[PDB]
Amino acid sequence: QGIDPFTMTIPALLSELQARGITLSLADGELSFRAPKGALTPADRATLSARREAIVAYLAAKAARRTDPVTITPSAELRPSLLQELWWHWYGLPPRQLNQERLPLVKLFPGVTAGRVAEALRAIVARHHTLRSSFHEEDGRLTVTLNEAAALPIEFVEADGTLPREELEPALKAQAAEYAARQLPLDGQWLLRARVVSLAPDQSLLLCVFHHIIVDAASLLLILAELDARLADPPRALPAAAQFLDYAAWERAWMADPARQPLIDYWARRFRALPELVGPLTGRSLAWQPGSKVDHRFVIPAAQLRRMQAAATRLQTSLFSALLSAFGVALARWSGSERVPVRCVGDLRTSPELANLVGYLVCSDVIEIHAPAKADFVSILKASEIESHSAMMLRVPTLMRHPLHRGGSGIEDPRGIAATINMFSVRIPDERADPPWPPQLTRSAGEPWPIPLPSIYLRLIDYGHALEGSLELNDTLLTAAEQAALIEALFDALDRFLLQAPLTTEVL
Amino acid sequence: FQGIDPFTMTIPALLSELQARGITLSLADGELSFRAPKGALTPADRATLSARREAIVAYLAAKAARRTDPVTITPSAELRPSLLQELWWHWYGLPPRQLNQERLPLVKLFPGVTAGRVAEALRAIVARHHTLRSSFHEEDGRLTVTLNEAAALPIEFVEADGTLPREELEPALKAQAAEYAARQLPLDGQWLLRARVVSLAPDQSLLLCVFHHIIVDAASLLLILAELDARLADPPRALPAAAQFLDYAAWERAWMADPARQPLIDYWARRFRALPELVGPLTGRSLAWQPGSKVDHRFVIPAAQLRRMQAAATRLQTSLFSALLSAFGVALARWSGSERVPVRCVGDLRTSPELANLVGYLVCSDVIEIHAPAKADFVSILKASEIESHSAMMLRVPTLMRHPLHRGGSGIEDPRGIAATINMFSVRIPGAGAPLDERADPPWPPQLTRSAGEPWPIPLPSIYLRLIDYGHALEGSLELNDTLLTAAEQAALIEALFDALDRFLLQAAPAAAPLTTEVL
Predict the structure, then answer these.
(1) DSSP codes, B182-204
(2) Start and end of every TubC N-terminal docking domain (chain B) (predicted)?
(3) Tell me, what DSSP letter sits at residue A309?
(4) What is the β-pairing status of strands A142-146 and B193-201?
(5) Which of helix, strand or coil describes residue A422?
(6) DSSP helix/strand/coil, A391
(7) Residue B223, class by beta-carbon neighbours within 10 Å (0-12 exposed, 13-18 middle, 19+ buried)?
(8) Is A53 touching B (CB cutoff 8 A)?
(9) B516, A40: Cβ pair inside 8 Å?
C-alpha cells in the first residue's frame, strides 16, 4: 500500500480500499461506500472528498464496461467491422504490402492423405464465414462480400518424403518460406491461400497464409486445433463457435450506444495526459514515424526461462507481468524518463461466449509504469498489476489499435506511445545448463515502412520450454548507439530482476 | 525486494541484495574481495562495486571494528566512573531541581510476605550488584565514584491501614507511592536509591523503591523485580548468574580506547555529518533539541487492536517493533513534509548471554534514516528500514548519540541534531501495565491524556515516542517540546501517527464483521 493515497491513481486508491474491505459504488450520480463499521477513516473520507470528481468519472467508465455475458445474436447484415475499416483505411493498398499483413500456417499431418487435409481445410473455411471475406470500395464506402468455399483453389504439389531428414527438412523449409513470401493483397479476391504438399500417399504438409485483417494469432491456433480434431481417427467433436460476422454486428451496436460515452471520455482524457518519450541521445520524439523496421531476435532457453518463472512465482505474479515490469524499467533507465507508457497487446476472448471465435479480436491495454530510481522492482510490479487489471476491465475494441488519418474520439490512434509489448503463450508439442547471458541476438534486414512504424515493439512468445523474443525497432529513428543501449537495458533488467532471484573467492 | 538503481542504494542495502544472491564481500589487507557462485557476479554488479569501492571499504572496515561475541568481562576490576556516568554527570549537572527522568520508581505488592523479609531481599539485591551502591563526588574537578555499604542502606518501614475498604485503601496507597517517587534523589546524594516498605498488615507488604537512572535502566528495573520474586518465593529460586556492571565498565572503557575502533567511529561521524535537518511544518524552526517544556501525550492501545497490529507484522514477516518504527517514520515524513527522516532508536546492549541479567545502565542508540517518498509503498519502506536497523545494531558504539556534550567529543556522541527518538520495549509480567480491555471494537484513535509541562532549561528531545508492549496492551507516550512545536503542529503529529498506525497496521483486520452502506 502506497504512502500518499492523495496522489495514487484511482485504480490503486480503489484497490487499496478494496483490500481493507471498502468498496465504492456509483448510482444516480450519488457516490457511496460499503464497509464494516469504522473501516472508512476520516483521512479516507478527506481523500475521497478531495478526489470525488476523478472517482465518479472512473466509476462511470466502469459502469460502461463490457459485461458478461456477451450475447451474440445472428445478424442478417454483411458489412465491414469497425476494426476492418480502421485497417483498410490506415494501411491502404501499397504496391508492396507490409509483411505483417500475412500470417502463415505450417503443419505436418503424418498418416493423412493430401485430399483429407484439403477437405478438412475447406470445411473450416466453409464454417467460419469471415475467412471468406473480400473487400472493395465503391464510393469511398468499404464493402465486404463472401467468397464461396467451393471456389477456394487449394493447390496440390509434391515432395520426396523418402529423402533423408537432413535434405528433406531444408527443402520443406524453403517451400514454406517461398510460399509465405508471396503477396496476399488486401484487395485480393481471397484473403487466404492453401497448398498441400504430398510427401507420400499418406503423408501431407499443409501450407496456408491468412491475411492479418481477418485472422489473429489465436485464430491460427484455433484453426490448427480444429484441423487436428477433424483429421483424428475417429474425428473428435468440434466445440461450438460464434461467428465473427455476428460479433461484428454486436460490436458496432455496443460501440454506438451512448452508454459508452463515460468509458470513451475516460480513456480520451487519460491519453491527453500521457508524457512523451525522447531519444536519449537525439532528443527526437519517439512517437511513431516512418522508417526501417529492424527485428532483433533472441531465444531464452529452458534453464533461464525456468529461473524466470520461478522468480515470477516468488513475486506472486504472472510471467507476463514480470516481463512487462522489466520492460518498463528498462525503458525508464534507457530513456531517462521515470514515467513510461506501454501499449500491451491483448486478446478480447475473455469470456466463454468468445472462446472459439475465429477472426480478428486483438485489443490494447495501455498502462503507465512508474520507475523512480529509489524504487524496488516488486513495488513497481505491484502498481503495474493494478493498472493492468483496470485497463483490461475497461477495454474498448478500437482503442489504440490502428492509427487514423482523421476523425476519431481520441482513443483510437496509438502513434503517441513509443513502446508496445505483445506477449502470449503456446502449449502445443535445448537444456544447456550453460546458457550465455545475454542470449544470442540476430539482427534482421530492414523493412521499409513509408507510414508510421511502432518505434519500439517487443514480441514475446512463451512456448513453455523456451521464450522467443523479437525487439522490433525503427532503425531510422533510433541511432545505433541508442538501439544498443536499449538492448543492453532490456537484457540487464531481465537479468537483474528475473534471473538473479560452487563458491569461489576473488579480489575485486 | 531489490532496488532499481543500485548505484544510489545505501551500502547496507547493496550488501543485503548481494547476500540474497550468495555474494559476500570481504575486506582483507585493505583488499576488497568477494565470495559467490562462479557466475553470480555480473558486469553490472562489478561496475557498481567498482564505482562505490571507497564507501564499501569504509563500511567493511567499520564492520571489522564492531563488538564481537563473546564479550569477555574480566572480574574484580578497579573502581572508576564508567564512560556513560561521566557523560551523564557532565551534561545534566546538579540543578536545584533535577529532571524527573532521573528517578525510576519501583512499586510492588508482596502478599503473604512480612516487611522484614521484603527488606532483607531488597538489601541483598543491593549487596550483590555493586553498581547499585555507587556515590559520586569530584576530586579537583575529576568525577570519582565510591561504594556505599549495603548494611548501611536505611530502609524505611511505615504502615498503612490494610483493613480500610478497597476504595479508601487503593487511593491512599497510590498517593503514598506518588509522594515517595516525587522526592528529589539528587545525583550527588549519598545514596542513588531509596527503599521503603509499607506494611498493610504483618504479612502484607508494599515495596516502594526509587533508583537513580544514571545507575539503573528500565530493563534493570525488571531484573530487580524478577530477582525479588525469586528471593521471596517458597521455595526460593536459584538466582541467574550476573556479571557486574563495574567490570563491564572497565571492559567498555578499554574497548573504546582501542585504536581498532577508529574506522567504526569514522563511519558514524561521517554518517552524522550527512543527516538532514527537519523543521517544524508550520514554524520553519529547526527541530534540533532546545530548552522548553516537556509535555507527555499518553495513550493505550488495547488488546483487540494490538492483536491486529501483531497479525499485520506477521503478515509482513517482520517484528512488531520494526512495523511500529516504520509507521512512526512515515508519520514523521508526512507530518514534516520531509521524505528523509532520521530516527534515534533507543536500544539495549544486552544482546549476548554474557550480558544477560547484568544490573546497570546499558542503554544504547541505533540511528537510522527512513526514506518515505510519497510514491513508495509501506512494505518496501519497512524492508529497507529493517536492513538499516540490522546494520546499525551490528555497528553499535555505547557512547553513540546518548547524551549531549558541552565540549569535547568525536562527532558521534551528541544526539541533539536528531529531532525524533523512539524507545520500544516489551514486558511479560502477569497483571503489569494498563487495565485489560477485551472489547472487540474499541474506539480509534485511543483517548489521549496530556500531562502538565515539565520545565527543561537544557536541550530537550523535540519528539520522543515511548512504547511498551505488555502483551495485552501497548502503552504509548509521545513526549513533545511544547515550547517548540505549536499546538497545531503537535495535534497534527499525533493525528499523523494514529493515521499511520491505523492505515498500515490495523486495517484489513476485522474478521467478517457487519457490513454497512453509507452515501459519501
Answers:
(1) HS---TTSS-SEEEEEEEEETTE
(2) 11-60
(3) H
(4) unpaired
(5) strand
(6) helix
(7) buried
(8) no
(9) no
What length is written for chain B? Answer: 520
The cell numbers describing B12, all together, are 547496507
Experimental approach was X-ray
A441: its cell numbers: 541476438
Instruction: Name the 3-class secondary structure at A183.
Output: coil
Which segments within B112-219 are labelled E, that is strand? 134-139, 142-147, 156-159, 193-201, 204-212
CA–CA distance, B71 with B465 (Å, rounded to integer):
31
- Single out the residue of A496, A498, A492, A453 nearest to residue A331, CA to CA: A492
| Cβ–Cβ < 8 Å for B368, B353 | no
Name residues 427-466 of chain B within 8 A of A (Cβ). Answer: 441, 444
The answer to whether B375 contacts A377, with C-beta atoms less than 8 Å apart, is no
Strands A467-474 and A289-300: antiparallel
What one-letter code names the amino acid at B317?
Q
**A30-36 and B515-519 strand pairing:** antiparallel
Exposure pattern of B108-118 as b/e (b: 16+ CB <10 Å)?
bebeebbbebb
Resolution in A for the shown PDB structure?
Answer: 2.0
- Amino acid at residue number B344: R
Q: Which of A49, A383, A508 comes nearest B33 by C-beta?
A: A508
Residues 87-116 of A with CB under 8 A from B: none
CB-defined contacts A:B, below 8 A: 153
Q: With an 8 Å Cβ cutoff, are B520 and A32 in contact? A: yes
Beta strands in B202-303 (DSSP E): 204-212, 290-301
Number of Cβ within 10 Å of residue B515's Cβ equals: 12
Report how far residue A407's alpha carbon sits from residue B508's, in angstroms, rounded to the nearest whole number: 47
CA–CA distance from A348 to each of A152, B12, B287 (Å)? 29, 46, 57
Q: What proportions of chain A, in percent to the nearest 5, are helix, strand and coil?
A: 40, 25, 35
For residue B192 the three cell numbers come to: 542513588
C-alpha cell at A250: 454486436
Q: Return all residues near B65 (Cβ < 8 A) that are at least 6 apart.
A: B260, B261, B262, B263, B264
Given a contact cutoff of 8 angstroms between Cβ atoms, the answer to whether B53 and B45 are in contact is no
CA distances from B494 to A35, B313, B490, B511 (A): 26, 22, 6, 27
Strand partners, A420: A343, A457
- Which residues, at least 6 apart from A388, have a Cβ–Cβ distance to it below 8 Å? A321, A324, A344, A365, A367
Q: Which cell numbers in the block locate residue B288?
A: 534540533
What is each CA distance from A327 to A136, A466, B50, B99, in whole angstroms?
40, 18, 26, 59
Give the angle A71-A72-A76 at the CA atoms, nearest 5°. 145
Are B481 and B455 in contact, with CB atoms under 8 Å apart? no
β B204-212/B103-111 pair status: antiparallel
User: Rounded distance, CA B57 to CA B78, Å?
Assistant: 38
Q: What is the secondary structure of A242-292 as a DSSP string? A: --HHHHHHHHHHHHH-GGGHHHHHHHHHHHHT----B-TTT--B-S-EEEE
- In total, chain A counts a number of residues equal to 508
* CA–CA distance, A144 with B492 (Å, rounded to integer): 68
Consecutive H or E run containing A339: strand A339-347
Residues in B touching A326 (Cβ below 8 Å): none
